[PDB]
């Protein structure tokens, strides 16, 4: 048990994702909402998303998170897994987080082009890794269903 393992566990304990939503970047139309904290590790989260998001060239994501702990360089690494095979990897940087602050984090996700929704549905896991700089804070997973 190292000082960094301890710091990582202090940030996670102080961390909470309050709400999240996806809109078609193009129209700004709201595709998916939810207030379930999908960043919580150790449990497989589920999300039923409209299969039209696969057609979106870009989707605008809003993350609303609270953090008791100060973070130097808060960033995300998200790997798109199809049947255990990584097809994509996104990188997002928020940067400095003020201790005991609530923050809205707007990220624009750019499209791959895609296998049809019917093939992908329930076979896609989004593996989100939660970093402060190069310190891994948490690893969480969400299984996607396209409806
Ligand atoms: C199929 C491609 C997409 C654009 C879906 C995006 C899904 C998410 C953003 C859920 C991941 C959860 C978080 C903790 C951010």
Residue numbers in the entry: 1 to 113, 117 to 150
What does the paper say about this structure?
RAS is a major anticancer drug target which requires membrane localization to activate downstream signal transduction. Phosphodiesterase 6δ (PDE6D) has a beta-sandwich immunoglobulin fold which contains a hydrophobic pocket capable of binding to the farnesyl group. PDE6D binds to and sequesters the lipid of cytoplasmic RAS and has been proposed to deliver GTPase to recycling endosomes, which is followed by release mediated by the small G-protein Arf-like 2 (ARL2), allowing RAS to be trafficked back to the plasma membrane. The resultant lipid modification increases the affinity of RAS proteins toward membranes, where it is required for signal transduction. Here, we present a novel strategy for targeting RAS by stabilizing its interaction with the prenyl-binding protein PDE6D and disrupting its localization.
Within their HVR sequences, both HRAS and NRAS contain a cysteine residue in the −5 position relative to the modified C-terminal cysteine. We were successfully able to cocrystallize PDE6D with C-terminally modified peptides of both HRAS and NRAS. In the crystal structure of the NRAS HVR bound to PDE6D, the electron density for only the farnesyl can be interpreted. This is most likely due to the flexibility of the peptide, whose composition, including a proline in the −1 and glycine in the −3 position relative to the lipidated cysteine, could provide unique conformational restraints compared to the other RAS isoforms. As NRAS has a cysteine in the −5 position, analogously to HRAS, it is likely that the cysteine would be in a similar conformation. We therefore hypothesized that these cysteine residues could be targeted to irreversibly attach an inhibitor to both HRAS and NRAS, generating RAS isoform-specific PDE6D stabilizers.
